[PDB]
Amino acid sequence: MEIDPKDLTFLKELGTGQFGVVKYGKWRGQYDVAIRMIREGSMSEDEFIEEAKVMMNLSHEKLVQLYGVCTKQRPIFIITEYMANGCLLNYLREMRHRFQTQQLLEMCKDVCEAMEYLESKQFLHRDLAARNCLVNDQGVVKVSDFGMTRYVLDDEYTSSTGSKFPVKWASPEVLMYSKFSSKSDIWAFGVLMWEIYSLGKMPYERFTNSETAEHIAQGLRLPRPHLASERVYTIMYSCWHEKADERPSFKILLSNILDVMDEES
Ligand SMILES: Nc1ncnc2c1c(-c1ccc(Oc3ccccc3)cc1)nn2[C@H]1CCCNC1
């Protein structure tokens, strides 16, 4: 729902993100929130505003809540659940020697659950990666910035060959046909799992986007992380089938994950 900025407070600067500055603050006094000021000229505003009403009704424990927005001024404000420990990529890098494999698999259960809820709502992320997931004060991981890429005006961020396109998370059908589906989000989730168990290493770090696209197209797959068991690796590898329909759904994926968690006792 719309929020009167009168009911907001700006308390701290968190930095400028992909879509503009973000600040920590309090909503209605008792709610820790993160307020994003939408970079001007970056978004299809009218379309984005109308779609925001759809993305507001999405609720799930492992999905960064949207509490509301302020659109009756510019820049649009986005009021979201405050994730004190920030992006999963940076949480992973700062705490490399703190994670036991049980917490890593947990982080995968969190993400997989959020993506299974998005699967059940027929809502695609289109840019699933570790850089778009956030962590709250209890170490829980939650997905964010879902569906945002549908409204970026910069064509580098959108085209298959754009200099800013996340090639390293894209499925072959996204690179070759721009056919976005839940299966491409599954491929991306596989890459994300690899990020998690790699503790935030860049997938195909020493490959240009073109080199990555071509290697993937001819069968190359990420190496088993040092901290990944052969069963976890089997799961993220099953996410990377050439045939999209050959990839397991997030529900089947969550089940396999939970089987591994049970077997790690
Ligand atoms: N929610 C946060 N909690 C804590 N930290 C945060 C955020 C955000 C953030 C704000 C709005 C936002 O919009 C959304 C769009 C679609 C769905 C959900 C949200 C997405 C993310 N940035 N940051 C930090 C990360 C590190 C660098 N500085 C900024």
Of the residues 4, 46, 127, 262, only one is catalytic, namely: 127
For residue 251, give the 3-state DSSP assignment: helix
> Does residue 113 line the site of ligand 1, with CB under 6 A?
no
Mutate to test the pocket of ligand 1, among 63, 64, 88, 136 (most ligand atoms within 8 A of CB): 64
Q: Where are the alpha helices (DSSP H) in the chain?
A: 45-56, 88-94, 101-120, 172-176, 182-197, 209-217, 230-238, 250-263
Which technique? X-ray
Looking up tokens 């978004």 gives 43
Domain architecture of the chain: domains with CATH:
5-81 (3.30.200.20), 86-264 (1.10.510.10)
| Nearest atom in ligand 1 to 81's CA | 1
> Does residue 66 line the site of ligand 1, with CB under 6 A?
yes
DSSP codes of every residue in 20-86: EEEEEEEETTTEEEEEEE--TTSB-HHHHHHHHHHHHT---TTB--EEEEE-SSSSPEEEEE--TT-
Tally of residues, the chain? 265
DSSP tag of 153: -
CA of 22 relative to ligand 1 center, distance in Å? 7
CB 133 within 8 A of CB 114: no
Both structure tokens of 251: 């529900």
| Nearest atom in ligand 1 to 22's CA | 29
What are the CA-CA distances from residue 184 to residues 62, 168, 175, 239, 243 (Å)? 20, 12, 10, 9, 10
CA of 209 relative to ligand 1 center, distance in Å? 26
Nearest to 69 by CA among 10, 5, 121, 132: 5
CA of 131 relative to ligand 1 center, distance in Å? 10
Looking up tokens 């894209």 gives 170
Both structure tokens of 255: 């089940």
Distance CA 83, CA 91 (A): 11
> Does residue 83 line the site of ligand 1, with CB under 6 A?
yes
Both structure tokens of 42: 């970056």
Is 110 annotated in the active site? no
Contacts made by residues 23-30, CB under 8 angstroms, sequence distance 24+: 24/82, 27/3, 27/67, 27/79
| Nearest atom in ligand 1 to 84's CA | 4
Distance CA 265, CA 196 (A): 20
> Does residue 148 line the site of ligand 1, with CB under 6 A?
yes
Tell me which residue has its CA closest to atom 20 in ligand 1: 145
Cβ neighbours of residue 205 closer than 8 Å, sequence gap 6 or more? none
- φ, ψ of residue 201 in degrees (nearest 5): -70, 145
Distance CA 143, CA 198 (A): 19
CA of 15 relative to ligand 1 center, distance in Å? 10
For residue 135, give the 3-state DSSP assignment: strand
- Within 13 Å, how many C-alpha atoms sit on residue 204's CB side? 19
Looking up tokens 């491409």 gives 184
> Does residue 52 line the site of ligand 1, with CB under 6 A?
no
> Does residue 219 line the site of ligand 1, with CB under 6 A?
no
Distance CA 60, CA 171 (A): 26
- φ, ψ of residue 256 in degrees (nearest 5): -55, -45
